Design a protein around this ligand. Structure first.
Ligand code: M6Y
Ligand code: M6Y
Ligand code: M6Y
Ligand code: M6Y
Ligand code: M6Y
Ligand code: M6Y
Ligand code: M6Y
Lengths: 222, 222, 223, 222, 223, 223, 223
């Protein structure tokens, strides 16, 4: 797997590949790893599939639960803390092979500067969290290739569309070097998934635009 | 890795993919896994790369050594036996992680019926060898996918071209279901390799013909 | 074992072999591995016989339990989640050898398009689930053979007859390459079991129809 | 450690960092890890220092040895083979923690096309060897970062000088993300070492040029 | 990691590096390891990032919890005891790999001599605690280089400014000899953090001040 | 560590070194290992620092807790038994490396002959206690050097001053032959600590007196 | 153990402590760990005493053997290589607990200018070797403290005499922080041993000069 998240002026973007493996064997081609966990938050998990899906579902439920009980959504800090506590809860099973690392991306409606209200948070198997203050981050077996690619491409990010394009390119490179990360499949028409978040909330990026960006990248490297 | 071999009327064809992994990481994209070990025999190996290459080189040198010392090539049974012995000798190292299994294709100039003078021989880690009588065979992490593909496609083989087609398509299904087997790279222009052997000997199938076949398959499945 | 399931226009079909082994020894020849778990869903399980039987029985009981307590049947998603939870619960035992993997085929009466209301769902030992969007799937020791077979035959599936044919042939290829999957036994008259599900519910396939299909496949492979 | 090597029109360049560690403790600041192993080849090793130095010294002795015994140097293929044999010979010790991997950069005086006479060969612990066709390569605890950096920077290589700059930058990104690879030390004035090889032979790149390049990179990233 | 702390006439200073690692890979560049845990104390922690952050957070919360429950803050000895107990509770996890050792700096308002009211306390994995009576201490993978450095520099501490400088130079030596401690980053403008505590309380040292001291130290080492 | 305790006419003296180590590394130069546990008893502990300090503190709290609850202090036998029970209760952790052995010195106000009212009780890891009838005892890694020294020097004890001297010399020999026991540090003016108990209770011995005794021993061995 | 060596303008100096241990027990007070292995080189070994002494003896014999056989002494690089090969050869015993690590200090009579002909080479258990270009190095249980001490004191090295002072003070700091390295023993009159090498060869430093320096260092730390 590879999940990528990067900040652009006024919002944030997260993308994920579609591949699922059992050792060397390909067990899935269209798995959706990026979830809209609330109006201003998207979560993307890598690792054991059962644990990842459970993480996304339970997490979303917990946030909305607090929102309905208290009539107000948690602060972003509280969201980070809840996610980390959940990851720490699974540490023993993670030692037994059921490991799942999430990557958090959101838009903080209470931050001071609305242009820099975008947020990207990494986690580790111990439940330690770190807010990324350098614009992008990745997680999964291709996360280093995606981070080194974004390190070079990030200067092209000036708005939503350029940020989305750099995210899809970083997923392209991750898949280029990591056999556990699926690239674009032109035969079947399956492309990475994406969520973008700004002042109006978190929305699913349409498949078509991601496909145009992918084909452009492909034709550019030929 | 996936290596395939199949018999067509009056000849045999062997083809292999180009991928090399270190776990999940792609360590090579243009590897050659099918070596012409002599004028009438080709060998394709799956497993530890350092071991497979040594297998091919040493095997070729042994067959030619016998030829030059005794003025005549080994009978096909002799070639089989020497390869089996070489594999058996590597069993200890193979248990300690350095495993490599070969597949042998050949054209027996001493067969009665030149129509079925093709030969396909498969091997196991303990030196066991079996002459395949059902037409085709495969070795490597994708070999089950490729064999089950050739089970459905083999009835279409009536000559070298259809055999090459079924071979490339079998490698395609392999890459499709196994991340350790590489599919055709249309961006970089890299395709599987193929050796074809008939009465005029063993010869390397040129890249452009395999590329044509691969593009046909890709266009058909869209 | 091999269980296969596949979608066809307006329905789903699932079939399973009849073999039971203790290592190399054959301990059963007529096992029923595919169960009608409710009016619109079948479950086929591969693994330790005892755990597979218990799974099917407890699962059917659970769905009907909810239905009677609440007056309405669970959504298909609910059914998935429930089977996955039950598999997750058995993980510790699975680590010690009491392993069972199910496969779920069903018709969703609440789907928008009635012709694509078929559903195929696969699971792993950790309770992960995936809704299969390529129309066919399989589980058990023969599942790779059966899947690579259906990968070539699936273009022939245009109705329930064709889908049943493809499914029986996939079980045949599985039995052909995997010794823990039993092929048709013409001497004893024992053939794989199968269920078909569509808008009118889920029905067992009479043994004689599977017999006809098995004889067709055999004679085809013969000449 | 990180060792990089890339091809440019008419030659090859190799560069390595200067860091030696004992776990977390920095035990070395000016280690030379890239050696001119003969008039047309340089080797750079990562891993256990004792083994690395042993490899460089002994390998050089073996090449020159053959040359004096036989009046002519080994073919590049022979050099590759000898280095792979050495590495395989160290495999048991490597299994016991005495691991060391070489990277080979050469210029083949017997190549047909003088522009594409550059050679880069990577190795694994089993003695497997692979000639790199895609232009660059690296080895060591930072090789992944350096390779992903060169993936984006390689299109700037048009002569020896731009290739050297790209190499030094790749080492810079390695040091950036990998604590076992040392960056430029402006306080002590210690910089990566580099060897450059073309038709006129292999020569050490003078430290001053690497200092200039490193400072250009540093200023650029400020 | 390297956390240092030292006493000067009238107060105490504590400073920490910014690096985060996962084996050899650098995973963090701006990590805050030194926290103001109450108006007159600062805890810095080395070890597993998760455990460290939870230690600082829970410790601060506990101190304020006592303060608000009983109307008065804990005695410094009480604070030491609470932190020691927290460290001891984590011992099993620590042996399992989730190790975290704190270092505690403080200014005791209830001490006899305000000029010597500064306090430095070090801890071990079993929860043992020692009040340092030689003026400086350090925790982490570069703590020994830091302490040996402060042994030679400490006679230059006569006030808060000299103390801050010596602390930053000790972290400099630590990063100089420890790949796991991060030295000043002049390209990104990231420097160690520091807290200073006197009778007016505990304040964060502004980044610009640490940057000035770092630049001065680096110029010194260059010439 | 080395703690020593010896009886003199009408009282008892206990003294301990000041060193703390982690393997070979010195982690403490001024550690106090001899605690006044009540007006008529001092305890000195060897082993893991955190356990030693916890023992001393908890034991004092227990003795005073009883004294306040029942209006009267425990008899000396009672104090022995509580210390022994505390030690036994730690035997599992001691098995896993949290090992700490105390050494008790006291003055039994209820004894008939005030000349022999001094008491010295040694313990082992399983809770065993033994009242020492021969007048001196020691505990720790230097304990054998200290006991063999006092075997030769004890006949010179006729009052508190000679007893104190012999205790300091015992510790001096211990430090001389045991690296985990700290000799006197004349560069820093740190010397072993001593508690003395007679009918007027237990008091800390001023550092000055121990210092003069130490210097007298050092010169007496310089020539 | 702690061995130090540093370059001074015109030569090199090596100094070694005198302690021997068996666990915490001090087994030796007068060990000589720094050997004149030939006219221009000294070797100081840390580790198992039998292995270290064997190393010094056999290495000296080997050098002189070559010298008498070929009429000319080995190049300094050759000396390095022979020592490294010896260490590498003992690696297996070293892993069974018979570990010994040498430090080599020499004067290369073939260097261009004689003011920088000093050489300091360190080694590891695998036979790796490194010519130190920063002026100083130490090996042993106290080498970290000694190195971080010389890091600060090395600017004071301007000739052989100041070199010896800094070497002895590095050893003093090592003994201050490491119980396995022995400090100066003023009662018994035992001090570290030292060799100095210049163009006139290698010479043992007379005990009286080492004692002078030691007393100066002590009377400086104390006041
Ligand atoms: C224990 C244990 C582990 C596994 C295992 O490896 N299970 C695989 C998954 C798998 O084979 N099956 C088959 C049936 C359903 C389940 C699936 C669920 C969802 C999607 C695709 C498949 C896995 O977890 N593989 C890992 C390596 C993986 O590919 N993870 C990708 C992933 C990331 C995030 C996410 F939300 C979902 C994902 F699948 N099985 O038992
Ligand atoms: C022990 C040990 C094993 C390995 C290891 O995993 N070594 C990898 C190979 C690898 O990373 N490198 C990098 C430098 C050279 C070597 C390479 C050689 C030839 C071609 C491409 C690369 C492997 O053996 N991977 C296996 C799983 C593989 O991919 N094998 C494919 C293969 C089959 C036949 C053949 F002839 C060549 C092949 F690469 N390393 O140490
Ligand atoms: C522990 C342990 C496991 C076993 C074991 O391997 N027990 C065998 C089964 C077996 O020998 N006997 C004999 C009498 C009853 C029992 C049976 C039950 C039901 C049906 C046919 C037989 C098994 O579990 N074999 C596995 C490998 C198998 O063949 N499983 C096929 C299967 C799948 C699903 C299902 F519902 C029923 C099945 F038999 N014994 O102890
Ligand atoms: C067994 C065993 C292993 C080690 C060990 O970790 N030994 C370290 C090296 C080390 O501490 N010392 C100190 C004295 C000489 C030796 C050194 C050699 C050469 C240069 C600088 C120092 C190592 O090998 N570390 C590895 C991880 C390393 O840093 N490798 C970088 C490197 C690559 C190629 C090369 F030629 C030289 C190198 F140092 N020691 O015993
Ligand atoms: C089990 C297990 C261990 C680890 C692990 O090694 N986790 C690393 C930390 C890490 O890679 N990540 C990535 C995202 C979150 C987490 C992070 C949190 C906060 C700040 C920066 C990062 C660690 O713990 N490394 C240790 C060795 C370390 O670097 N410790 C320095 C440190 C000290 C105090 C402190 F408060 C925070 C620190 F990072 N993960 O699972
Ligand atoms: C598990 C585990 C063990 C240790 C460990 O060995 N911890 C050391 C002590 C140590 O390094 N530190 C560092 C700061 C706090 C703590 C300290 C506490 C109190 C006084 C001085 C230091 C120890 O216990 N060493 C033992 C071998 C020792 O020297 N014990 C002497 C001693 C006896 C009685 C007593 F009351 C205090 C003592 F220090 N740590 O985690
Ligand atoms: C196995 C095994 C190990 C040991 C062991 O611990 N052997 C001790 C040495 C020891 O107790 N004795 C007593 C009589 C002779 C022998 C001695 C030799 C020479 C000088 C002084 C004593 C050691 O090796 N201790 C180590 C930890 C040590 O202290 N090493 C310091 C040292 C370095 C270099 C050198 F040349 C001599 C030294 F003593 N014995 O068997």
């Amino acid at each position: 797997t590879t999940i990528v998240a990067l900040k652009y002026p006024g919002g944030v973007v997260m993308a994920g590949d579609r591949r699922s493996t059992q050792g060397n064997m390909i067990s899935g081609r269209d798995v959706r790893k990026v979830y809209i966990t609330d109006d201003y938050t998207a979560t993307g998990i890598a690792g054991t599939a059962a644990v990842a899906v459970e993480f996304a579902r339970l997490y979303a439920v917990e946030l909305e639960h607090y929102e309905k009980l208290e009539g107000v959504p948690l602060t972003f800090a509280g969201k980070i803390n809840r996610l980390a506590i959940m990851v720490r809860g699974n540490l023993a099973a993670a030692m037994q092979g059921l490991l799942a690392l999430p990557l958090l991306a959101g838009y903080d409606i209470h931050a001071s500067d609305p242009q820099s209200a975008g947020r990207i948070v990494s986690f580790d198997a111990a439940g330690g969290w770190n807010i990324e203050e350098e614009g992008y981050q990745a997680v999964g077996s291709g996360s280093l290739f995606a981070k080194s690619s974004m390190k070079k491409l990030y200067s092209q990010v000036t708005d939503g569309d350029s940020g989305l394009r750099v995210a899809v390119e970083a997923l392209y490179d991750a898949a280029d070097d990591d056999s556990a990360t699926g690239g674009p499949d032109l035969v079947r028409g399956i492309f990475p998934t994406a969520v973008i978040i700004d002042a109006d909330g978190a929305v699913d990026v349409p498949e078509s635009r991601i496909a145009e960006l992918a084909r452009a990248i492909i034709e550019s490297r030929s």
